[PDB]
Amino acid sequence: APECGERASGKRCPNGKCCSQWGYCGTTDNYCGQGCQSQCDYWRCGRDFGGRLCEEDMCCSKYGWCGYSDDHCEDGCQSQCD
C-alpha cells in the first residue's frame, strides 16, 4: 500500500528518503530519479542545494554529492567530513 506522495495524503518519507512516482520510499535511482515526487535531492548537498546536510552522517563532497568515501570526505568536503 502506497506510503508516500499524492496517494498517501501527501505524506513524506522518513529519514528524508525519496518518494517514487508510485508512492514508495527509497534511495535508488528508481525512487530519486525520473518520476520522483518528493525529497528527490536526497543525494545532493552543499552550497548548490541550499546548504543542505546529508542524512545518515554522510559527508558532502566538494561537488555536492553525499557519500562516505575518501573522495566525499577529504579535500573540499563541505560538511559532516569527520
Contact between 20 and 37 (Cβ < 8 Å): yes
Number of neighbouring beta carbons within 10 Å of residue 67: 16
- The residue among 37, 6, 44 whose CA lies nearest residue 20 is 37
For Ca ion, which residue of 1, 9, 50, 57 counts as binding (CB under 5 A)?
A: 57
Residue 72 marked in a binding site: yes
Residue 42 marked in a binding site: no
Nearest distance from C-beta of residue 81 to Ca ion, angstroms: 8
Please state the residue numbers annotated as binding site for a carbohydrate. Answer: 20, 22, 24, 31, 43, 61, 63, 65, 72
Query: In the complex, which residues of this chain contact Ca ion (CB under 5 A)?
Result: 57, 80
